[PDB]
């Protein structure tokens, strides 16, 4: 079973701008582990698979979270550190293109449809249970959990928003945007690491390690 109540609980339990962003990322990685432990059945996966899932999913998971956190702000993102990054500040730091993608493809779209915290939590749980993650000892088990999440998400959407039959699909169809943005954010992170003039903390650094 995969109750949306437990998924919302997990969300509520955890509730140079590039430097501030990277500092926020590291901080949130610790919080991400605690979030994942609160997602039903995650903790009962083999430890190595928990590792694979979080290493595969961390960037999209963090991106989804800060994007939804920023829905009430115009032309900016809210970091969990309490810091705001304005569009202008991002642009002035040479990261304007990817920042604008986050705002247009994620934040504004979450705002437009009033994505709620249960829906966000479920989307994040779907991302977490990524059966395509390489090295999984039992991909079918992870596929099964993902199926349970999106079965539960749809039921939630049909009950809470019966006037919006396309809402469930609309939620899922932000996932390709999240995937591409996640990949581009990672590319920037690897560059910041390569260049060496951006402090990267230990957990964030560990995520940039090879498998």
């Amino acid at each position: 079973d995969m109750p949306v109540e437990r998924i919302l609980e997990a969300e509520l339990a955890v509730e140079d701008p590039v430097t501030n962003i990277c500092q926020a990322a590291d901080k949130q990685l610790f919080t991400l582990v605690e979030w994942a432990k609160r997602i039903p059945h995650f903790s009962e996966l083999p430890l190595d698979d928990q590792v694979i899932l979080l290493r595969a999913g961390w960037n999209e998971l963090l991106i989804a979270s800060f994007s939804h956190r920023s829905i009430a702000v115009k032309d900016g993102i809210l970091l969990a550190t309490g810091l705001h990054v304005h569009r202008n500040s991002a642009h002035s730091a040479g990261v304007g293109a990817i920042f604008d993608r986050v705002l247009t493809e994620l934040v504004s779209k979450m705002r437009d449809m009033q994505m709620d915290k249960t829906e966000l939590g479920c989307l994040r749980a779907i991302v977490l249970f990524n059966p395509d993650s390489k090295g999984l000892s039992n991909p079918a088990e992870v596929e099964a959990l993902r199926e349970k999440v999106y079965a539960s998400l749809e039921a939630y959407c049909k009950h809470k928003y019966p006037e919006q039959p396309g809402r469930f699909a609309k939620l899922l169809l932000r996932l390709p945007a999240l995937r591409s943005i996640g990949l581009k954010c990672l590319e920037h992170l690897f560059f910041f690491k390569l260049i060496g003039d951006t402090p990267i903390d230990t957990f964030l650094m560990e995520m940039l390690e090879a498998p």
Partner: peptide
């Protein structure tokens, strides 16, 4: 991946 393992351990 020592940090992740440790945090997941408990």
């Amino acid at each position: 991946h020592k940090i992740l393992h440790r945090l997941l351990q408990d």
